[PDB]
Design a protein around this ligand. Structure first.
Ligand SMILES: [Zn+2]
Lengths: 222, 82, 554, 763, 225
């Protein structure tokens, strides 16, 4: 009773950052196991696209303020954590941000070097007034997952740089659901649907493709 | 059976207690032997003494106390209580 | 919240633990609270209040100025990363903007544990009340790695170190950079005076301030003098006395305060220079730390799973913390369950969907809570708060997420998917949002280890050095347990070579490094002191041998 | 095993790793190795797991009550700064996970490591050295997990159905693996009543005999009807253990763990408890146990019905006032209403809560009303009493530690010195009374018979000097023997300490006590530890062990005969008419507030024996001494002492108390020219004295000086010019000598280890 | 991206029982692919088994079969253990008919061309005095485990997959700097039709092929080495 019809993976679209994926059909009790097997891979090993360390010329460490700025340095660091960047990179490339006078500093004000791009220029970083001047460069690296601060005592960064927690995870939220139809009514089979969402750094298809390549390369038979 | 022991639990105390009187005698039993083995790896025993063992095939980096326990498990040595 | 439901024991416990919380970097206000938050915060004195109605002229991280209609001009300097009495960072945040028109008595800047004027001693987390594969056992807790990645439970902690240069018996202390026997790398982070430069990262043992004090007649060892001439390093005149970071500590240097004598100043007689270094630490919520809610419930962090393998709702929304069912029957701890459900209500809003009147349970309710948007804050004063009937009604009304699916039923439960197996948990699990706190008990402060270290003067027992390395106490009761096992050797080892044996502990360390057998223990110094105390009392005691008559230690 | 933070294990083994990374050409000299560890260069970690391997460490949590409060573990380097403790040892350490801290000690010498691996190893210490019951037994989640795993649900999904007219039995499955495959699909429920065939499991003893008799199935097949859970459960137990087929409660698991602890080495028990931990936890999660409003809330009928019965108590008072009181009619009626409502709410709540309700499930398995809310005044009253429990709990811990120290102070030198003293002396045990006794487990279990157990029919069952295991108790109960004479430390004639046979089975090992065991200290701890659960409590206990005259004295029969009960308003008078018949014994002074002794009650004309107690209360131990003699005193003290703890539900084996009591009657008063041994080589009478006075009378003066009031002991010792032979273990502790117990005994520390000439040839 | 070289080791427990280990996996890939492996081995390997059988003499009789010691139920459980590889794909009807007192041991069943029994020593039934038994049994290939669904026709539960019992567990090894690396342990008991090693290759091959559907969306993404 080997009802044989290879599984089929067809794309979909719900928004621009996220799009559904449906795979049908395959053996019962396979949906949940295969769905979470990709989810655990998406939420982890999708490469980024993240900022390592930054340097504010006016400050020497993280626990001080900038004349005229409204947010303290430690609070600007927490605002910069919301940066969703993407870079071909392959090496530490530094970005730059210079703002002056009254206004609001956002991610758009950040000048990305050749090969990198900021995917959320509308994000708020800091609010400057008349006496507010903010010059800050940001080192962007490429990795995956979450890496804690790259303390400049393990590396050779000197007193200027201030390491920052990096988060290389283009994927935002992921779920799935199964709808095995006619469980033994005539012939039994299940079909799963995945809801993948990204941070705009990459598309759901590319992420799922990156996860697929990760699992495919992983299942080794020898 | 008792499946298989992992590390410290090997060998079982029950199979080791049959080789000596009480759990306390077992302690001194293996303790002094461990002192003997470690002397052998060094220069032993200074003047007028020559270290013996390991009698069993030692593990990769097995500890001398762990060796004296396997030796007692195999009856490779006899002791006399005072 | 829901004080009328918890037992006096847990309520007392809850109150005590509320004042044990630590200020978080973000400081989020409680989603389900009472009424005192606003009043308690502004009255504590740790929040900036506007004395006179008016408008803001300047808003900067350093200060805030208000142009009152009266014409007067008031300014408020903000505490920025100010160390509290027990190392807790107190940082004030401005909550107002330039053109804002503020009334008298209003809140201008948030304190350490405040948000928008009301106390924020903790964070609102997604909770699931299911036992999870034994990792949340008894009172243990498991957290999502999100709490580390998003710095939700991260709190800054500042430490103060101090050193002094005074006149001594044979010379005057001099705090200088040059250290006797050191490499140029260890002094690489010191400034020209010898104090650690601002913003420098300091590891355990690194030098903070280089102090040097006069040493008497050298009378050095010949084996050392020979190497002196060989390598041409002149045996310096005085001894080394540098201030290093305590063992197990680390962080960045915030500020340095230097009080000199040439600069007149005012120091105790003999003191020439006085400098203090302040070191700060950004503490991620780490496994082992102690969390607790407002109802006396407390427990350590037993594990922290990656957000991937975590019970998650159908949305894919992982839960933040998994709490086992601590409350055994009769023990109850009912108040906790209530705020958890209300937490989900306040997070998702509600709408009674009134049709042909309002349900009988909402009759006692005043209009205002009928409709509420998502993420709304609620206040249920202690004795006069929400009631059981009104709760279940709010449970019925729950605005769906994006796509309109529902995540929680009228029972406050949801079918969670095991993030590891991928298969759902067979039964619906209770989920919600509970306001938990980070307590002062921290792993970094409570972990101690010691191989060798300083020893007291009077009693030669291992003394907890002011840097650290304090030894553990093997009390009288532990000795009883050791005697119970019959482990005579382990007991003797603890009370002799590991403590009072002056020549024993050194020969043991020596024997360990060489790899030799551990020598036989000697006489514990405590006993020798005992005989001396007896003799001083005119008690002629003699340690008689079996055939050796009298003997003495010496 | 135990989880050890890498940083903690590093600094702890710092000298060790220093040598290893110097042996390996990583660092060239010691100094180079020190900085390599201090700066935590990543090259040391690999070296650390080697030095740590098979190197045991000791874990301890204050306060230390019993010896199990310190155990050895295999150190595993774990990420983080916390210590990972095994969930089964929590019971022993009494370790909450609400911020509790534990200490780590690194045994160094070869002897120390040997003592940790052998004596103090975690897996070797499963049974409580006080009751013999298991402590590593699963608890809390593990219980509910296994309770849910083995529970049988009628009408389950894959429930078995007898073969119908046109179809066969549908609940049968080829093997347990098939049921697993059926479980994965929506076919089989873990808690269904299917019947399956088993090849590698053991059938019940009674059922198999029918199916076999030729021999228990090693690979033989056989079918029984169970639940897949119960099948998956028995797979955890040893392959040699017969099937159980029951929903597992704490007691069942307690009953099972005990049964399998007697018949298997602990390694088998250690692994079996570990497997139960995994299953219990795994199924505890799938158990669906969660709390919510609908789980707690309130039975609405309760609040309504409570106001109903409250009206009956108010109007009854109205009827009471007019003239319908009729004296005791009210008190009884009000009780009938209050208990009728109290009993009616239990049903209104028990029947209203589903059988599988999460709160009820936790209660049934054995792992373990503000719902409406209280107004302002209601909460105030509740605080008045709640604060008394916290303050009263502060006094429970202080005195229990002050009692445990005196207990240890008097019994520490008691150790086993020989295998057998060969004395016929023994003490009788009541052993059942049904015609099984309630307290046979504390006084009869783990004993040795001084005389053979003879049946009336002439068949001897259980020979003298037997271990008296629970199977032996049943075999004895089979022949219907009421009493049994048993060896005891009260009767041991050992010149020094006690002997193995008289003491009996070690509660921890389950076998005969080892010669070196220091039972006195174990006894003190076994008694002091439960002192925290005393409410007829801790003061009563100290009254007994200190030999003080009872708070409210009670008389004992000075002779045998009839009794004349006389009633006088001033006092009760009890006259005893002896059966001699000689001079009558009068007990004139008696307070009516002391009541009478119970058999019915002691009435006029009843018969009384030589040691009977006449009135309710505590008999003067010094009184019963001169009447019944020393041996009967020790039986009395153990009787009263055990009755206190038993009142609190504490299981202490009589031998522990006996060890303490033995030390009270060890001396005699010299009326004309102290210990007993001196008289054999000038009349003296047996003396009873408290533990504090007895301890101060020890032959060691610096031992007694350390106990209480050092001045008097020092002054009296200096004048007498006493000399301490360093005989006890406290002395050797102070001076740093090897205690004369355990590995300190001469026979154990003088062992010679020489390899057999045959082994040296193999090389 | 590049990993740390996880290896695949196998320890043979018995002739048809072997446990495998993968070391080391990145936290926390142990559980990710783990549960998916057990699910693939159990219900994704092709294999032939018995679907339905009919026995002469039992049409409305439910309990017993005359002339045979084993009852109806017990007889089925034996046949379920019958392992036979049939490449015919479609339902083939084998016949087993033995007479006289004796022991029917599968070897007595004549398999049609295309089906091969692998346990000829299997005990199917015991024969009574002067008694014959003619059994017809349907056999069609399948996957996994399909439960049971003409007079005297008895549908039986079908154990299609060669894999009989599979379980997995995870641990932590590989100290270095991070001691939370995952080690995957998988325990598989196989019937003699195919070895445990081959079963893993089939399960692994079907997984990679199944996950190739997400890869084909873009083979340029980074994934892992
Ligand atoms: Zn005796």
């Amino acid at each position: 009773m080997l009802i044989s019809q290879r599984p089929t993976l067809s794309e979909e679209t719900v928004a621009e950052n996220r799009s559904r994926f449906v795979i049908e059909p395959l053996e019962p009790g396979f949906g949940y196991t295969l769905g979470n097997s990709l989810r655990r891979t998406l939420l982890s090993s999708i490469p980024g696209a993240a900022v390592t360390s930054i340097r504010i010329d006016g400050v020497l460490h993280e626990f001080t303020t900038v004349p005229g700025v409204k947010e303290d340095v430690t609070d600007i660091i927490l605002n910069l954590k919301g940066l969703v960047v993407s870079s071909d990179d392959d090496e530490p490339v530094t970005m730059y941000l210079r703002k002056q006078g009254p206004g609001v500093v956002t991610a758009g004000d950040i000048v990305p070097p050749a090969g990198v791009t900021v995917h959320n220029p509308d994000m708020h970083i800091a609010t400057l007034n008349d006496k507010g001047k903010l010059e800050v460069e940001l080192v962007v690296e490429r990795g995956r997952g979450y890496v804690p601060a790259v303390q400049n005592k393990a590396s050779g960064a000197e007193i200027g740089r201030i390491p920052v927690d990096s988060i290389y995870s283009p994927v935002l939220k992921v779920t799935y659901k199964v709808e095995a139809t006619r469980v033994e009514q005539r012939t039994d089979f299940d079909k799963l649907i995945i809801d993948v969402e990204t941070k705009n750094s990459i598309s759901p298809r590319d992420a799922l493709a990156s996860a697929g390549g990760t699992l495919v390369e992983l299942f080794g038979l020898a | 059976a008792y499946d298989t022991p992992l590390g410290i639990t090997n060998p079982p105390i029950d199979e080791l207690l049959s080789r000596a009187s009480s759990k306390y005698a077992l302690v001194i039993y293996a303790a002094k032997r461990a002192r003997q083995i470690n002397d052998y790896y060094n220069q032993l025993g200074d003047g007028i003494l020559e270290y013996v063992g390991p009698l069993v095939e030692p593990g990769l980096q097995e500890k001398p106390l762990s060796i004296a326990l396997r030796e007692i498990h195999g009856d490779l040595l006899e002791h006399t209580e005072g | 919240p829901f004080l009328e439901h918890d037992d006096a024991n847990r309520a007392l416990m809850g109150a005590n633990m509320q004042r044990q919380a630590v200020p978080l970097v973000r400081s989020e206000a409680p989603l389900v609270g009472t009424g005192m938050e606003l009043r308690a915060a502004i009255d504590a004195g740790d929040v900036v209040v506007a004395d006179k109605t008016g408008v803001i002229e300047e808003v900067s991280a350093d200060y805030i100025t208000v142009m009152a209609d009266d014409g007067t001009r008031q300014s408020y300097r903000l505490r920025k990363f100010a160390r509290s009495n027990h190392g807790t960072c107190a940082n004030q945040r401005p909550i107002v903007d330039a053109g804002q028109r503020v009334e008298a008595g209003q809140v201008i800047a948030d304190g350490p544990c405040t948000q928008n004027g009301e106390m924020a001693l903790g964070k609102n987390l997604l909770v699931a009340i299911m036992p999870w594969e034994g990792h949340n056992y008894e009172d243990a807790i498991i957290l999502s790695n999100r709490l580390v990645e998003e710095d939700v439970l991260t709190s800054i902690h500042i430490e103060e170190h101090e050193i002094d240069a005074r006149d001594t018996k044979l010379g005057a202390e001099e705090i200088t950079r040059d250290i006797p026997n050191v490499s140029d790398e260890v002094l690489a982070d010191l400034d020209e005076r010898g104090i650690v430069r601002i913003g420098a990262e300091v590891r355990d043992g690194d030098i903070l301030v280089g102090k040097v004090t006069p040493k008497g007649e050298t009378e050095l060892t010949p084996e050392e003098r020979l190497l002196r001439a060989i390598f041409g390093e002149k045996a310096r005149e005085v001894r080394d006395t540098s201030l290093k970071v305590p063992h197990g500590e680390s962080g960045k240097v915030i500020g340095i305060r230097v009080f000199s004598r040439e600069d007149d100043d005012e120091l105790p007689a003999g003191v020439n220079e006085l400098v203090r270094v302040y070191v700060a630490q950004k503490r991620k919520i780490s496994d082992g730390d102690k969390l607790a809610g407002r109802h006396g419930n407390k427990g350590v962090i037993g594990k922290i799973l990656p957000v991937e393998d975590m019970p998650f709702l159908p949305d894919g929304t992982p839960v933040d913390i998994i709490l086992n069912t601590h409350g055994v029957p009769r023990r109850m701890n009912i108040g906790q369950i209530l705020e958890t459900h209300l937490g989900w209500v306040a997070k998702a809003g509600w709408n009674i969907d009134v049709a042909a009147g309002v349900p009988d349970w909402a009759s006692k309710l005043p209009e205002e809570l009928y409709s509420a948007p998502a993420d709304s804050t609620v206040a249920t004063p202690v004795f006069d708060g929400a009631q059981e009937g009104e709760l279940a009604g709010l449970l019925g009304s729950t605005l769906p997420n994006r796509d309109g699916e529902v995540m929680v039923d009228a029972d406050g439960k949801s079918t969670l998917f095991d993030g590891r197996s991928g298969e759902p948990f067979p039964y619906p699990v209770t989920v919600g949002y509970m306001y938990i706190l980070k307590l002062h008990h921290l792993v970094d402060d409570k972990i101690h280890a010691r191989s060798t270290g300083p020893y007291s003067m009077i009693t030669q027992q291992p003394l907890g050095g002011k840097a650290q390395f304090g030894g553990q106490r093997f009390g009288e009761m532990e000795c009883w347990a050791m005697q119970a096992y019959g482990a005579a050797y382990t007991l003797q080892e603890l009370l002799t070579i590991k403590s009072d044996d002056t020549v024993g502990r050194v020969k043991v360390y020596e024997a360990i490094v060489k790899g030799e057998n551990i020598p036989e223990p000697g006489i514990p110094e405590s006993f020798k002191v005992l005989l001396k105390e007896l003799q001083s009392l005119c008690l002629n005691v003699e340690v008689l041998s079996s055939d050796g008559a009298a003997i003495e230690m010496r | 095993q135990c989880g050890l933070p890498k940083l903690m294990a590093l600094e702890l083994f710092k000298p060790f790793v220093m040598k290893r990374l110097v042996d390996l050409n990583h660092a060239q000299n010691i100094k180079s190795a020190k900085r390599m560890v201090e700066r935590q260069r990543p090259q040391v970690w690999d070296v650390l797991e080697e030095v740590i391997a098979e190197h045991p460490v000791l874990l301890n949590r204050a306060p230390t009550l019993h010896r199990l409060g310190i155990q050895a573990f295999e150190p595993q380097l774990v990420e983080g700064k916390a210590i990972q403790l095994h969930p089964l040892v929590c019971e022993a350490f009494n370790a909450d996970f609400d911020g509790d801290q534990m200490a780590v000690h690194l045994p160094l010498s070869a002897e120390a490591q040997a003592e940790a691996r052998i004596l103090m190893l975690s897996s070797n210490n499963i049974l409580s050295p006080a009751s013999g019951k298991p402590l590593a037994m699963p608890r809390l989640d593990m219980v509910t997990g296994l309770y849910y795993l083995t529970t049988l649900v009628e009408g389950a999904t894959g429930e078995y159905q007898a073969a119908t007219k046109d179809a066969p039995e549908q609940g049968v499955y080829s093997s347990p693996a098939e049921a697993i495959m059926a479980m994965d699909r929506g076919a089989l429920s873990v808690r269904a009543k299917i019947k399956v065939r088993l090849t590698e499991l053991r059938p019940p003893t009674d059922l198999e005999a029918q199916l076999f008799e030729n021999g228990w199935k090693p690979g033989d097949a056989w079918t029984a009807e169970t639940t897949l859970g119960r099948v998956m459960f028995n797979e955890l137990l040893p392959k040699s253990y017969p099937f159980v087929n029951e929903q597992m409660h704490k007691k069942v698991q307690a009953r099972i763990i005990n049964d399998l602890a007697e018949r298997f080495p602990m390694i088998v028990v250690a692994q079996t408890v570990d497997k139960l931990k995994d299953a219990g936890f795994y199924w505890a999660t799938r158990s669906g146990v969660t709390v919510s409003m609908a789980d707690v809330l309130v039975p609405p009928q309760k609040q309504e019905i409570l106001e109903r019965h409250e009206a009956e108590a108010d109007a009854i008072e109205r009827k009471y006032q007019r003239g319908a009181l009729n004296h005791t009619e009210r008190n009884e009626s009000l009780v009938k209403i209050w208990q009728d409502a109290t009993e009616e709410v239990g049903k209104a709540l028990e029947e209203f809560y589903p059988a599988d309700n999460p709160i009820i499930t936790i209660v049934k398995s054995g792992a373990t009303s503000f719902r409406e809310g209280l107004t302002v005044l209601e909460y105030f009253i509740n605080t008045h009493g709640a604060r008394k429990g916290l303050a009263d709990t502060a006094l429970r811990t202080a005195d229990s530690g002050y009692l445990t120290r005196r207990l240890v102070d008097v019994s520490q030198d008691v150790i086993v010195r020989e295998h057998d003293c060969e004395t016929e002396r023994g003490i009788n045990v009541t052993l059942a009374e049904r015609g099984r006794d309630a307290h046979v487990e504390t006084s009869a279990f783990a004993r040795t018979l001084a005389t053979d157990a003879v049946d009336a029919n002439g068949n001897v069952i259980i020979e003298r000097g037997h271990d008296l295991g629970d199977p032996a108790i049943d075999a004895l109960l089979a022949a219907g023997i009421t009493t049994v004479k048993v060896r005891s430390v009260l009767t041991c004639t050992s010149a020094t300490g006690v002997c193995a046979m008289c003491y009996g089975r070690s509660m921890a090992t389950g076998k005969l006590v080892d010669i070196g065991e220091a039972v006195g200290i174990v006894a003190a701890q076994s008694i002091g530890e439960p002192g925290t659960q005393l409410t007829g409590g801790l003061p009563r206990v100290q009254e007994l062990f200190e030999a003080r005259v009872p708070r409210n004295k009670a008389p004992i029969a000075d002779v045998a005969g009839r009794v004349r009960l006389e009633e006088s308003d001033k006092f009760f008078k009890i006259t005893i008419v002896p059966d001699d018949g000689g001079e009558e014994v009068v007990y004139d002074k008696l307070s009516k507030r002391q009541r009478l002794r119970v058999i019915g009650v002691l009435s006029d004309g009843d018969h009384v024996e030589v040691g009977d107690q006449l009135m309710e209360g505590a008999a003067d131990p010094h009184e019963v001494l001169r009447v019944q003699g020393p041996r009967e005193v020790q039986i009395h003290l153990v009787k009263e002492v055990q009755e206190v703890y038993r009142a609190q539900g504490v299981s202490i084996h009589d031998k522990h108390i006996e060890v303490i009591v033995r030390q009270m009657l060890r001396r005699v008063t010299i009326i004309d020219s102290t210990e007993r041994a001196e008289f054999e080589a000038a009349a003296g009478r047996p003396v009873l004295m408290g533990i504090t006075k007895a301890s101060l009378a020890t032959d060691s003066w610096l031992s007694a000086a350390s106990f209480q009031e050092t001045t008097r002991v020092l002054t009296d010792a200096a004048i007498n010019c006493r000399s301490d032979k360093l005989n006890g273990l406290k002395e050797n502790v102070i001076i740093g000598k090897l205690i004369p117990a355990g590995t300190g005994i001469s026979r154990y520390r003088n062992i010679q280890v020489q390899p057999t000439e045959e082994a040296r040839a193999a090389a």
